[PDB]
A paper describes a structure:
Here, we report cryogenic electron microscopy structures in which a p300/CREB-binding protein (CBP) multidomain monomer recognizes histone H4 N-terminal tail (NT) acetylation (ac) in a nucleosome and acetylates non-H4 histone NTs within the same nucleosome. p300/CBP not only recognized H4NTac via the bromodomain pocket responsible for reading, but also interacted with the DNA minor grooves via the outside of that pocket. This directed the catalytic center of p300/CBP to one of the non-H4 histone NTs. Representative writers of lysine acetylation (Kac) are E1A-binding protein p300 (EP300; KAT3B)8 and its homolog, CBP (KAT3A), which can transfer an acetyl group onto the NT lysine residue(s) for all four histones. That is, p300/CBP reads H4NTac at the bromodomain pocket, rotates in multiple directions, and rapidly writes NTac to non-H4 histones within the nucleosome independently of the DNA sequence.
By preparing CBPBRPHZT (residues 1084–1873) protein corresponding to the same construct as p300BRPHZT, we also determined three complex structures in which HAT of CBPBRPH is oriented toward H2BNT (CBPH2B·H4acNuc) or H3NT (CBPH3-I·H4acNuc and CBPH3-II·H4acNuc). The overall conformation of CBPBRPH·H4acNuc complexes was almost identical to that of p300BRPH·H4acNuc, and the H4acNuc-binding modes of bromodomain and HAT were also almost identical to those of the corresponding p300BRPH·H4acNuc structures. Whereas the inter-molecular arrangement of p300H3-II·H4acNuc structure was determined only at 6.9 Å, the CBPH3-II·H4acNuc structure was determined at 4.2 Å, so the domain arrangement of CBPBRPH and the structure of the H4acNuc-interactive region in its bromodomain could be determined. HAT of CBPBRPH in CBPH3-II·H4acNuc was located closer to H3NT than in CBPH3-I·H4acNuc. The density of H3NT toward HAT could be modeled for the C-terminal residues after K36 (second panel from the left). The distance between the substrate-binding pocket and K36 (~30 Å) suggests that CBPBRPH of this complex acetylates K27 in addition to lysine residues up to K23. Collectively, these results suggest that not only p300 but also CBP can acetylate multiple non-H4 histone NTs by rotating themselves on the nucleosome with their bromodomain bound to the acetylated H4NT as the axis.
Author numbering:
A (entry chain A): 36 to 134
B (entry chain H), I (entry chain D): 31 to 124
C (entry chain B): 11 to 16, 21 to 102
D (entry chain G): 14 to 118
E (entry chain K): 1088 to 1242, 1267 to 1372, 1385 to 1555, 1620 to 1638, 1652 to 1700
F (entry chain E): 45 to 135
G (entry chain F): 19 to 102
H (entry chain C): 14 to 119
Write the structure that this text describes.
DNA sequence: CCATCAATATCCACCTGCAGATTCTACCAAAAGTGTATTTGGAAACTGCTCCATCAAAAGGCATGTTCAGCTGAATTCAGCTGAACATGCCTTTTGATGGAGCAGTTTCCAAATACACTTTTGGTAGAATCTGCAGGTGGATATTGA
DNA sequence: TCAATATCCACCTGCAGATTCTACCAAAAGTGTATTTGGAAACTGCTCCATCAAAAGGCATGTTCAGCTGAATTCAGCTGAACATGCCTTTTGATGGAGCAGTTTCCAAATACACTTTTGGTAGAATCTGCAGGTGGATATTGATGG
């Protein structure tokens, strides 16, 4: 019949505000730990990891991703857009000098 | 049980000096300790470079003052320079 | 049973789509294209490539078989991404 | 009789700063007033950041300083942000900022 | 050589799994793995290497032996290893790989499929007490695999309820090949001349004889005709290519009376109907539900009231997206029919089934979700809103709101239905706050305000208990599409040949 | 056509592009603002000029990349501002 | 020592246009030049101030190329050919 | 009468590198093979950059290495560009690179 | 005049070994010297920091090899490590 | 759409003169290598010990999958208009020569920082007891949104 | 104006973490001699930096107009909001043991001189030359005339 539905974007802004007002980790611990262990094995086998080390990797990766997403949003805004596309990611990384 | 080096008590005393009724969590306390250690490393490295530039084998208060001026922002650099000068004068007069 | 002890896969796809969505939302992203996720995971893998390599090299020199948080933060600070709180 | 920190009127440990400078291989010799100056600078920076964090916590209706308050204080100060522009925080978050184009109407 | 070359690809596909196949590549060694109790549980240990050796040696006379050996290895691995163990997950993955790999080659050989199917761990019943069941992993006493007694009823071979009944097999009269009866969908009554393979009929020209025991040939009723017409119209307006024809037939209708545990007895009419859909060229039953109807001659407060006693469905309807809509269409059509007949009030008991309990269709699929009470209430509310949109339902409320609106003050004004929860609550209260009970179960019960079929004698479907008992006895399961098809064929045959 | 011509010409050559005297005057003025009575070496002035040219070239190429990122070939102030912000020189 | 002023105008419009061309920029808007001059002034404030402080630390009254190289290096703008 | 540089088969001065390491106040003690390893690494890097500069000069029909050829050579090498990503060479210029959009769009 | 040491002769010998018929200009030689000095400073700083990290007061070839792996990317690091190991083995073999 | 008279920046075929790079002799303080007694940072050998991995289980917070449409991303026209290309004028920028403000070379020696032997103070910190700010759940007044 | 809904906020309760003592104990800090050396200060030769002369390779304005660009328009479809399904990560608790680091012993390697050996800018002399322009073609090349 007539289901209640918010206009698109409002819940997105609510989520943005909620995640900016909070500092908890967003990436699940176990898959990130598995990825870190797999990459370490790609480097060298029999290399153990401490829990504090895994937490440090998670925090650093989340902070770097947040900064990259902010730069990507700025790049998308530059072209009169509000959606992120790979060109924004590439431009942000190139300006940052990583590429 | 090795002696782990930290600035815990001094930073807590500073917090009491500025905010007597405000505490600090362990995580934030480690944040403060790491920040102070990083600033110490930066100042010491810049002073070492300054000493090497002038072929000087000794680092004095002038080297650290110059390091603070180079690294710290304008108002912060001036305030730190004033605090260091006052500390040196008090130590000399002590 | 037949257990007591424990494949090199399931690493890049471990990062879930909602995780990338949450990371973008924390960065102020309002609209996310459906194909952002794969290159986001690739960039994440590049970052781990940069960090864990230095951490592993530091651990190898130290004659240790366990990666410690000091090595991680120290590789982070040598790369220009100094992190605080794991210096204990 | 009196410690160097007490003699100079600083809470930070002067002798400890001198020991760390000596063990850090920064220079062959270290001046007498260099640890005093470095301790004074460190104490001033710590006091300023702690005061800003306490102000942020008071604005946040909290009596305990948390990394969120620390990062809010750091980013709310232009000079502190410039000094710590390449510093990553744990459990600190980001400033509330919504882009103008993202705003409705 | 033919058997070896036919069975090698599936075995190789089993091997190539990594690391799922690693524990199964060598015979299990209790000494090496530190599991001395392995021989105590698994009486026939063997592994994939044994299978390869037998295939190379040609120890298999026909591939069903290989299939049985593979499934026996899977069963032993599942039994010895705990469900949370990684070995159990590896065995499950290997079983799925074998299932998806054996079928094409095994069909190309000339058979139905290459699976060894075992029935679900059905709970046995009792003959003496007539109300006692034997739970799983409980000792019982069995006579000729036909009579069963529990431990309490003892005060006969001793057995345990941890066994499984294998699926029946059939042998072709001409070819002699053995194949699953369920997969080929062959019944002796339908084809008394025996079972003939599809290839053999292809060498004959004449196809399989038409099955007269279909859902379409069932006796038609105006209510069932209206439901089937509405469903067909909805399917046509949707025009889904995967959707097929749906037949709705009433296979049981009689007159009974409910006795108070105020009129001494209330007469009513009970009717049972099923929904069948054309899938893969055969009828599959996917919906069934029981109603109790009290006409104008019924004493109050039950006068002119319809009540939905039990409701069951199968999630195998195609497409899955239109399954909910088809269920809504059927129920809305029933409500419209009873409104046209002159009924005033309808009652729905939205109570989710308990685990292990079947309403109508026995052995619900393991992947079929038992909805939570809130989800069932939301589903019923959505259905009632949809019906209201079609100006069919005058109003719908809950039992508590209806009671407080009607200002009811006595329990005699409450509707009385057979097997209903409220008469049991009233009996418990009398033996040992009624509004508190009404409010506690407010969302469970739905009351609907809306404002000639001949009786079919069917002792088999006269109530869900006999149907469930026959399904349990004959292993009529609904856990898979093929099992559902076999069960639908069997029930259609039973209704056609055992009707009264 | 022509614009691409001098683009190629200046990309091929490496000679200093800012005139020496105006740059020296600007450096002297800004240093006098910092501190008066400050002598300058010619090598120091050359170093400032080359560093400034390199920084401006990097800023201009990043700005062009930003401008084409917005489906444009003419650079806008927003291009320079966002390039500097992503570089960390502003925020 | 004459007090120099308004020397930011010494960065001529053709100079900024040529610098943009060297960076691959095809078209330049009219107000880019002033912003470029301001950015250059900001960079000069970042570098020359550090060089002046380095010179003062050495008790010298003349700025040398070595101080400039060190100031550029500490700001992540390392330059070659001028020593260090 | 054999020098340490010639003993290790390296052109770079082992003794000068060791003296520079001592003078830089990097550590209290320096190993014997430490200046040898330093000289080997520095010589390898110098040979690599010099061969790249020579190739760049040959590509431009020139016999003397100039900063332009070196800058082009190192920017061409992705590893060398990453190594010197924050390094500017005086009088080196930039790589000739024109975007396809900047080209005529006829 | 105070002596100003440089790698001029060694860089020239390396160039002659690689390209006998190619010369080098004064500006190019200055770029060579700046690059080699910067690489030496970076590697020495990394080695010193790493020695401080493990509480080691002596820098050996292992620390420099680790720092080379940290700094040089991929093929450069592998070739530098191989040549350094070969040079160390040759030095210790006499 | 394009084959092509005609003005124009420049690769190359070339070459010559000069600032710059290359070749040779000599000198010597600055390193560089060797010799020897001394000290020590670090290798091995064994072990006490702390958190790293692994296993088990419930279950609820979301990960996963599906659907409708709001409006966002993308494509197309076009007209105000800002800039590109260019001729005109001139002047500011570049190069060379010339007084002295400070950059460095030399010598004294005195306030200043090592080297080290105690003595006292003082910061982790084993361990138990009481205090305390916000984690988390409840409830309802309060904006916030959409039709 | 109003109904559905997320938010702010006050309030109450259990508890891991922050705060307060008791006693310890090794790691520095400080103090009191002995020694040495970094450099302040005075004097002074040597750069090279600011200032000023002319010569020239450019920069500063105005005009014309093809083309960059932003507003307006329309529309296919992309992902946001909502909902059903159920997945698997977290926490709690425990455990066999791989592995980290403390303790002891002791040795090849680093170090502090002393002496002898080589040696690389350094300054001046004289030779060699790579290429920066410039002159005479001349060649794609692109705006423009025209088929």
């Amino acid at each position: 019949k007539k289901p209640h539905r918010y206009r698109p974007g409002t819940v997105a802004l609510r989520e943005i505000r909620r995640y900016q007002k909070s500092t908890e980790l967003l990436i699940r611990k176990l898959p990130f730990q598995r990825l870190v262990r797999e990459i370490a094995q790609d480097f060298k086998t029999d290399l153990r990891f401490q829990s504090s080390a895994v937490m440090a990797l998670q925090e650093a990766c989340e902070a770097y991703l947040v900064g990259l997403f902010e730069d990507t949003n700025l790049c998308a805004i530059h072209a009169k857009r509000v959606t992120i596309m790979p060109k924004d990611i590439q431009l942000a990384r190139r300006i940052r000098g990583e590429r | 049980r090795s002696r782990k080096e930290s600035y815990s008590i001094y930073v807590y005393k500073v917090l009491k000096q500025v905010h007597p009724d405000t505490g600090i969590s362990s995580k934030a306390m480690g944040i403060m300790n790491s920040f102070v250690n990083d600033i110490f490393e930066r100042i010491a490295g810049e002073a070492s470079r300054l000493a090497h530039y002038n072929k000087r084998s000794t680092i004095t208060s002038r080297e650290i003052q110059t390091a603070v001026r180079l690294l710290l922002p304008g108002e912060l650099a001036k305030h730190a320079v004033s605090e260091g000068t006052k500390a040196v004068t008090k130590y000399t007069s002590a | 049973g037949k257990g007591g002890a424990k494949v090199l896969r399931d690493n890049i796809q471990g990062i879930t789509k909602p995780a990338i969505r949450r990371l973008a939302r924390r960065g102020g992203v309002k609209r996310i294209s459906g194909l952002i996720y794969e290159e986001t995971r690739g960039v994440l893998k590049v970052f781990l490539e940069n960090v864990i390599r230095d951490a592993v090299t530091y651990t190898e020199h130290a004659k240790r078989k366990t990666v410690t948080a000091m090595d991680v933060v120290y590789a982070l600070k040598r790369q220009g991404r100094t992190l605080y709180g794991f210096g204990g | 009789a009196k410690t160097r920190s007490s003699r100079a009127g600083l809470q930070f440990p002067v002798g400890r700063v001198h020991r760390l400078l000596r063990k850090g291989n920064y220079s062959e010799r270290v001046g007498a007033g260099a640890p005093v100056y470095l301790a004074a600078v460190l104490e001033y920076l710590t006091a300023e950041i702690l005061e800003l964090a306490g102000n942020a916590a008071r604005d946040n209706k909290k009596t305990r300083i948390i990394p969120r308050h620390l990062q809010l204080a750091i980013r709310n100060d232009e000079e502190l942000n410039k000094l710590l522009g390449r510093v990553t925080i744990a459990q600190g978050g980001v400033l509330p900022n919504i882009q103008a184009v993202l705003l409705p109407k | 050589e033919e058997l070896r070359q036919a069975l090698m690809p599936t075995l190789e596909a089993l091997y190539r799994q990594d690391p799922e196949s690693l524990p199964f590549r060598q015979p299990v060694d209790p000494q090496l793995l530190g599991i001395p109790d392995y021989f105590d549980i698994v009486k026939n240990p063997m592994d994939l290497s044994t299978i390869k050796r037998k295939l190379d040696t040609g120890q298999y006379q026909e591939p069903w032996q290989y299939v049985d050996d593979v499934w026996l290895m899977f069963n032993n691995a599942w039994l010895y290893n705990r469900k949370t163990s990684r070995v159990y997950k590896f065995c499950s993955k290997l079983a799925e790989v074998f299932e998806q790999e054996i079928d094409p080659v095994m069909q190309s050989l000339g058979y139905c499929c290459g699976r060894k199917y075992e029935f679900s761990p059905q709970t046995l019943c009792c003959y003496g007490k007539q109300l006692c069941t034997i739970p799983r992993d409980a000792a019982y006493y069995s006579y000729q695999n036909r009579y069963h007694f529990c431990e309490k009823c003892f005060t006969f071979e001793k057995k345990k309820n941890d066994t499984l009944d294998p699926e029946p097999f059939v042998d072709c009269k001409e070819c002699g090949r053995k194949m699953h009866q369920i997969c080929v969908l062959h019944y002796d009554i339908i084809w008394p001349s025996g079972f003939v393979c599809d290839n053999c009929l292809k060498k004959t020209g004449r196809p399989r004889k038409e099955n007269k025991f279909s859902a379409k040939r069932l006796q038609t009723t105006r209510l069932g005709n209206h439901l089937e017409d509405r469903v067909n119209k909805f399917l046509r307006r949707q025009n889904h290519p995967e959707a097929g024809e749906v037949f709705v037939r009433v296979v049981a209708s009689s007159d009974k009376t409910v006795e108070v545990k105020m009129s001494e007895s209330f007469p009513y009419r009970t009717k049972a109907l099923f929904a069948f859909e054309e899938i893969d060229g055969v009828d599959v039953c996917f919906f069934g539900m029981h109603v109790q109807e009290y006409g104008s001659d019924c004493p109050p407060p039950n006068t002119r009231r319809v009540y939905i006693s039990y409701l069951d469905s199968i999630h195998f309807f195609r497409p899955r997206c239109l399954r909910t809509a088809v269920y809504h269409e059927i129920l809305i059509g029933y409500l419209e029919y009873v409104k046209k007949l002159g009924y005033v009030t309808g009652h729905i008991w939205a109570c989710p089934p308990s685990e292990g309990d079947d309403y109508i269709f026995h052995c619900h699929p393991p992947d079929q979700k038992i909805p939570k009470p809130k989800r069932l209430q939301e589903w019923y509310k959505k259905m009632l809103d949809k019906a209201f949109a079609e100006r069919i339902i005058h109003d719908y409320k809950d039992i508590f709101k209806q009671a407080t609106e009607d200002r009811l003050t006595s329990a005699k004004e409450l509707p009385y239905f057979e097997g209903d929860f409220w008469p049991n609550v009233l009996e418990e209260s009398i033996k040992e706050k009624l509004y508190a009970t009404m409010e506690k179960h407010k969302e469970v019960f739905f009351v609907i305000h809306l404002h000639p079929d001949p009786l079919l004698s069917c002792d088999l479907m006269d109530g869900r208990d006999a149907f469930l008992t026959l399904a349990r006895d004959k292993h009529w399961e609904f856990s898979s599409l093929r099992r559902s098809k076999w069960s639908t064929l069997c029930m259609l045959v039973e209704l056609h040949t055992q009707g009264q």
